[PDB]
Design a protein around this ligand. Structure first.
Ligand SMILES: O=C(O)c1ccc(-c2nn(C(=O)c3c(Cl)cccc3C(F)(F)F)c3ccc(Cl)cc23)c(OC[C@@H]2CCCCO2)c1
Ligand SMILES: O=C(O)c1ccc(-c2nn(C(=O)c3c(Cl)cccc3C(F)(F)F)c3ccc(Cl)cc23)c(OC[C@@H]2CCCCO2)c1
Lengths: 259, 263
């Protein structure tokens, strides 16, 4: 369908655009998380007092929640800019562009959040901070149990040991899903996705030649993504009905209309 | 090792034919009008069909309940067919016995949905090994939540059948589903993923040889595992509403026990 050199060219194009779109790459995140580096060392928030100190240096459960919301809105912006660089995307019907982004952003946010995580916590404020998993999970009300499922996913996803060049193509595959509800013209979407899938396949064989059927294992993760986004939506709805005082950025609000 | 992957595909195809009563190939010949099946399209024809053909399930006198229970009864039969097929998958019987049970327990729903599509088109479903055809409009027009319980199955089947898999494809796909290393409570995940890797390799080659013009069909088929997980989840929630709502669902406790897995 497509030839090797063109598939490599498409992989390079997507990697380059992923670097331009997203300020904190997996490579930077891992350097910070593993360290042995004096200049990139994060301030660690593990309890109430350190949270207070962290805000000098850089209700609690609400404030943290709103922090997640703020970064997710920024992430939607970053993902939207990346999507525009995917060959063919901006040429699609405009309603279909909206639909693809609407249903894809959440799955991509979860994917890319994993890059910022290990089993003990998450990088924040462009890598300047690290908030512990124990602290997040111990938050009160339903807020604790709202944070933990993200770590549970990230630990499993990070076991695949993808790098940024891999993720660039994977994220593109997610966006160009022809099975989203209400798509008007499925065919041109599937045509682009076939190219991306071919590109992802070759990328993974060259970049992880010892890792048998990594292509398939990675596509199987799209299943974990769909499920957790569904749980997420239902958890958020219970939170809104309990906490009629906090609200959501209009953009996220619109994304959640009809889930 | 191509030859070994072909050997594995043939082994699975042969066993899938022995295990399952009606193949996709036979079902499609019946569905496309290629000894017509008895057609159930309303209440009167249902009555005649069970009087003359004797569709097993029949014994609540209320039709919508009886059809619903019929789905459950056939699904229980399917569990035993799937269990027998699983034993023919190389490596499966050597797994820890608790893990065999776990894999089957959490896989059977996804497999039943998959294989149900083989028996469906946009207009209805074959029953009793293809001796009967019950229309989609009849099923969907059943009252209360029963109609809306039937329709999602057709909605899935129509999309899945667009891939135009044949039995030799499906034999490997079903095996891939069974050998899922992410099932809850698995004790020894490694040998499960090892077998699945072999099956995935076998499925990949099968699809390239059998459908060489069908680009990235391997990937499209794995993406259907997403539709499968989602609809099984919906299914569970639909079942739960029915149990809490319906007072006339009662069967002999022993029948109830037999079906506990699917209610
Ligand atoms: O820097 C980033 O790239 C980033 C991305 C996501 C979160 C984050 N979102 N979130 C959500 O619950 C969430 C998600 Cl996954 C998707 C869409 C919308 C939301 C929303 F928050 F609106 F509801 C999280 C839940 C838990 C955790 Cl640990 C993180 C997220 C992100 O987090 C920012 C940090 C988290 C700790 C407190 C300071 O902000 C960053
Ligand atoms: O011959 C077969 O291979 C076969 C397989 C499945 C059904 C059937 N199950 N079902 C379910 O709701 C279902 C499913 Cl999809 C998966 C797991 C468990 C269940 C359960 F029934 F337990 F709850 C159906 C729903 C609708 C329809 Cl149209 C069919 C199924 C099957 O059905 C046999 C027919 C259905 C109509 C009445 C006579 O039996 C056959």
């Amino acid at each position: 369908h497509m030839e090797s050199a063109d598939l490599r060219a498409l992989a390079k194009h997507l990697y380059d655009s992923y670097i331009k779109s997203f300020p904190l790459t997996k490579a930077k995140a891992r350097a910070i998380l593993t360290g042995k580096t004096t200049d990139k060392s994060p301030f660690v928030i593990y309890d109430m007092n350190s949270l207070m100190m962290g805000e000098d240096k850089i209700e609690v459960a609400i404030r943290i929640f709103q922090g997640c919301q703020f970064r997710s809105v920024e992430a939607v912006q970053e993902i939207t800019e990346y999507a525009k660089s995917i060959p063919g995307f901006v040429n699609l019907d405009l309603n279909d562009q909206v639909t693809l982004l609407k249903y894809g952003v959440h799955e991509i946010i979860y994917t890319m959040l994993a890059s910022l995580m290990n089993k003990d916590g998450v990088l924040i404020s462009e890598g300047q901070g690290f908030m512990t998993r124990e602290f997040l999970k111990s938050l009160r009300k339903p807020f604790g149990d709202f944070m933990e499922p993200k770590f549970e996913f990230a630990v499993k996803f990070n076991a695949l040991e993808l790098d940024d060049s891999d993720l660039a193509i994977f994220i593109a595959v997610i966006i160009l899903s022809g099975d989203r509800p209400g798509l008007l013209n499925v065919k041109p979407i599937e045509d682009i996705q076939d190219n991306l899938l071919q590109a992802l396949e070759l990328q993974l064989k060259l970049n992880h030649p010892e890792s048998s059927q990594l292509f398939a294992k990675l596509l199987q993760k799209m299943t974990d993504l769909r499920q957790i986004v569904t749980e997420h939506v239902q958890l958020l709805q219970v939170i809104k009905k309990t906490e009629t005082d906090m609200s959501l950025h209009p953009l996220l609000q619109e994304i959640y209309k009809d889930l």
